[PDB]
Design a binder for this molecule. Sequence first.
Ligand SMILES: Cc1cc2nc3c(=O)[nH]c(=O)nc-3n(C[C@H](O)[C@H](O)[C@H](O)COP(=O)(O)OP(=O)(O)OC[C@H]3O[C@@H](n4cnc5c(N)ncnc54)[C@H](O)[C@@H]3O)c2cc1C
Length: 468
Amino acid sequence: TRSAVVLGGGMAGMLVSSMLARHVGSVTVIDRDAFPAGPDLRKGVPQARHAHILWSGGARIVEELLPGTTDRLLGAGAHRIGIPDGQVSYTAYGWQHRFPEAQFMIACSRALLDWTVREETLREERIALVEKTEVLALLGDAGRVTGVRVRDQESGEEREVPADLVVDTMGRGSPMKRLLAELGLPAPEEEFVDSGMVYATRLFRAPEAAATNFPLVSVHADHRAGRPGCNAVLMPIEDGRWIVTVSGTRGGEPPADDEGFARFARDGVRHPLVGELIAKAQPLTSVERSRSTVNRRLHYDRLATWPEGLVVLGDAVAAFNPVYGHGMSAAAHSVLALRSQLGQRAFQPGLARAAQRAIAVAVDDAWVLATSHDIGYPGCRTQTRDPRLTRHAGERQRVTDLVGLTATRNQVVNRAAVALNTLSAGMASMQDPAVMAAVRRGPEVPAPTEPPLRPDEVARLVSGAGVT
Ligand SMILES: Cc1cc2nc3c(=O)[nH]c(=O)nc-3n(C[C@H](O)[C@H](O)[C@H](O)COP(=O)(O)OP(=O)(O)OC[C@H]3O[C@@H](n4cnc5c(N)ncnc54)[C@H](O)[C@@H]3O)c2cc1C
């Protein structure tokens, strides 16, 4: 028997549905949007206009739950950029020397990634996708949730969809607070770190030579400096295009005009690299800024009471800054925290209280890595009580500076760094006796004085057809 219901159809909803469908009978995915039968931009996912990094940890977790996604993505035009052999990033501590492949990423427009995860998840006959359907209230009481009360927007007919487990994958704009309040509970301990970052993405047609096999280029800010931090990223996607993304916090926001965007990429960031790489490229669209870039975590886990059958994961319990790129891996890791809680307790009481506390730990790494750098920015309003950001947050800032400073010129420290920053290990793995010893060993390669671009990569920026 057993029956689940997943609210939302995003990266979180599809993933958790592909894991639940192997643990229950029927999975009913509810959403209020129009899902397209073709990698097109959607209104429920407006982030799809800006590029989305899928780190290794989230990549091989999507692959585990959706076999055949990586190769299908890699066949539609997505690249498997290695790390740090396929990235030319100006870190806060210098240029990242391009060591051999330690971890990897998946670079593609979010519209494709959401599709390749959707059409692969919907291959199971038990998952029933229900589009254009608003959610009104949760069915049950304050001790057990039994389903949802939805209503179609095209017909207006109300109904009662019940299930043994209600999953909330309703993005950053999760009305969970409203749905829970009507159920009869208090408000969760809201915690947020608001740096005020302002995204600014604009597509770029890569040169004909650099359509395939081009490295993830980025110029990062110095979180130890007193200036408003501002980054700039140039990752390649499908169909031979380039996503150029600039960012900035409260005080150094990027402009809206197209003519000013090409300036911020080379006259606002700490190095004018990307601004030179976009002068080799054909602009397509305009600047489509997004301001919903504020780490916000709602600790449902520490509530005094929690109903049975209700689980919240994705961007509904913990959403983070997009300049670091952990949103998808935190959701993927959260799904595995529910799975690693469904095999122990089955469908017994305590599932919700144990799956929420497990989801709490799953995103804890994606919550420190995000906020630990944002707290040091100017005029950032933060409402947080965890001591790792208040007191003795200097030691947490004094060590991370050292690890990141050595990782630029030390393989062992780098291979252990991107195994954590790309959510592929734990924060305890950075206390390895062979990592603390490699930090004390010091740099092993000189700091590059120029962008560590390979000649066979820079030569891929011009067509060269105007010569005999
Ligand atoms: C600008 C930007 C850039 C980002 N960049 C990155 C990045 O580089 N790397 C990374 O890892 N993460 C990134 N993220 C985060 C990433 O988008 C999210 O972490 C991820 O989408 C989480 O999936 P989700 O299903 O929880 O939310 P979503 O993917 O947003 O899914 C929400 C779903 O719920 C539905 N829904 C919403 N409201 C309702 C409602 N009232 N009723 C019914 N259904 C509803 C929507 O239609 C949608 O299907 C970025 C986010 C933004 C905004």
